[PDB]
Amino acid sequence: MQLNPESADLRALAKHLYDSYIKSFPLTKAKARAILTGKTTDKSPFVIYDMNSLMMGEDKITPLQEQSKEVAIRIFQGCQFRSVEAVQEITEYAKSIPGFVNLDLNDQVTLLKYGVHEIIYTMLASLMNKDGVLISEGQGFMTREFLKSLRKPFGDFMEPKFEFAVKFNALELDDSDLAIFIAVIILSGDRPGLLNVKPIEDIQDNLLQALELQLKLNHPESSQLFAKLLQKMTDLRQIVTEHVQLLQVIKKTETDMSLHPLLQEIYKDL
């Protein structure tokens, strides 16, 4: 590769996406890793490792009907809430990608329809180590084992995200890597119900060039890092499918899991 106006443009495009990513996302991976390795002071987050620490930490760290449920559904609702504010941050980030807004506004909504879920799993890995996950913008940390201990089907909810993350986090990407990767994902041309594929594919080819040069510059030691990273976009499609398939079984047994607390109370009296 050479220093030239083409290489310079791709660096300028990467700089633009980083700064825009730093503005769109309060809790970055650098911040996260700091809190996770205890070399922070911003905040020492509250650790939820059992039912005891759950309730001791819930007070200290939602509508009124949704207040009073099985511990499972209270936490799941914490993930529904976060998943809704995550979508706005990503929509904010999407806007700052050269060419994105200048497309069919129906194509934009489509690219974010299917995009958001993959980005959420991508950025979730940033908040994760082998022991658990940063929640409530880094103020808590819920353990993998506590999450796995929850009532079925909920106790299977986060476990694939952890498996993805371990593999993903071993690539050792930083916020400047992830910024371009995330923009590559959003401008996916092979997505359902798109009018003008071509201009989405054009932006993405430029983003893929930007990513390649980023990974070569930023990861001298590792290699086929570029290809390993495009393969992850497959592990993500499969994880999303499994998440949605799971959310079907969870939106089917709507309040069978929130009733059983009260059926137990009525049972003990009887």
From residue 220, alpha-carbon distances to 2, 160, 177, 226, 229 in Å are 16, 30, 13, 12, 15
Residue from 30, 28, 49, 26 nearest 39 by CA: 30
Name the residue with tokens 């060039």. Answer: 209
Measured between alpha carbons, how far is 153 from 92 in angstroms, rounded to an integer? 33
From residue 241, alpha-carbon distances to 36, 192, 213, 234, 236 in Å are 29, 14, 31, 11, 9
3-state secondary structure of 118: helix
Under 8 Å between Cβ of 200 and 115: no
Domain boundaries, the chain: 1-270
Helix/strand/coil (H, E, C) string of 44-75? CCEEECCHHHHHHHHCCCCCHHHHCCCHHHHH
Name the residue with tokens 């009525």. Answer: 266
Determination approach? X-ray
Token pair recorded at residue 205: 């080819």
Residues with Cβ within 8 Å of residue 144, at least 6 apart in sequence? 130, 131, 132, 133, 158, 159, 162
Token pair recorded at residue 55: 């309730």
Q: What are the percentages of helix, strand and coil residues in the chain, rounded to 5? A: 65, 5, 30
Under 8 Å between Cβ of 219 and 58: no
Q: Which phi and psi angles does 64 have, rounded to 5°?
A: -85, -30
Measured between alpha carbons, how far is 8 from 152 in angstroms, rounded to an integer? 52
DSSP string, 140-206: EEEEHHHHHHSSTTGGGSSHHHHHHHHHHHTT---HHHHHHHHHHHHT-SSSSS-S-HHHHHHHHHH
Question: Amino acid identity, residue 77?
Answer: Q
Residues with Cβ within 8 Å of residue 243, at least 6 apart in sequence? 117, 121, 160
* Residue 62 CB-density burial (10 A; 0-12 exposed, 13-18 middle, 19+ buried): exposed
Measured between alpha carbons, how far is 7 from 82 in angstroms, rounded to an integer? 37
Q: Taking the C-alpha atoms of 68, 70, 72 and 76 in order, what is their torsion angle to the nearest 10 degrees? A: -30
Q: Give the end-to-end CA distance of the chain in Å, rounded to a whole number.
A: 78
Name the residue with tokens 């993500």. Answer: 236
How long is the chain? 270
Binding residues: 80-83, 117, 243, 267
Question: Amino acid identity, residue 267?
Answer: Y
Under 8 Å between Cβ of 147 and 132: yes
